[PDB]
């Protein structure tokens, strides 16, 4: 349940939060990167990652939970956009 944590480095978790941010908002322009709202996005990502890190029972399940989250967020974004068309 929590033994796998010993193999996961903070450096890894950081790269993963980064991938989580890119998955939500792939390529922000300089103005967006500077916006306070971008900080809100990053904090949300770190929150999700921490949630999955503290509920997974294996490294494999940890990646899987993150992927499911990403799938779900991207689906939410796509639907919202289509609803305006």
């Amino acid at each position: 349940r929590k033994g796998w944590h010993e193999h996961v480095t903070q450096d890894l978790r950081s790269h993963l939060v980064h991938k989580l941010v890119q998955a939500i908002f792939p390529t922000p322009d300089p103005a967006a990167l500077k916006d306070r709202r971008m900080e809100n996005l990053v904090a949300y990502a770190k929150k999700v990652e921490g949630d999955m890190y503290e509920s997974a029972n294996s490294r494999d399940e940890y990646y899987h939970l993150l992927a499911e989250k990403i799938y779900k967020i991207q689906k939410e974004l796509e639907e919202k956009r289509r609803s305006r068309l």
Binding site: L16, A23, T27, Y63, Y71
Partner: protein, 42 residues
């Protein structure tokens, strides 16, 4: 395929892995496995 390979290379070089490039059909489960792969990479 119709996209000139030099343009393809330029675009792919400059696109983050987590960004979608197109909306080709594939199941939810296959996309989630792909996402797991993209996270696992170094």
């Amino acid at each position: 395929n119709i996209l000139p390979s030099d343009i393809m290379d330029f675009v792919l070089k400059n696109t983050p892995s987590m960004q979608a490039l197109g909306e080709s059909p594939e199941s939810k489960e296959k996309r989630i496995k792909e996402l797991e792969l993209l996270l696992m990479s170094t």
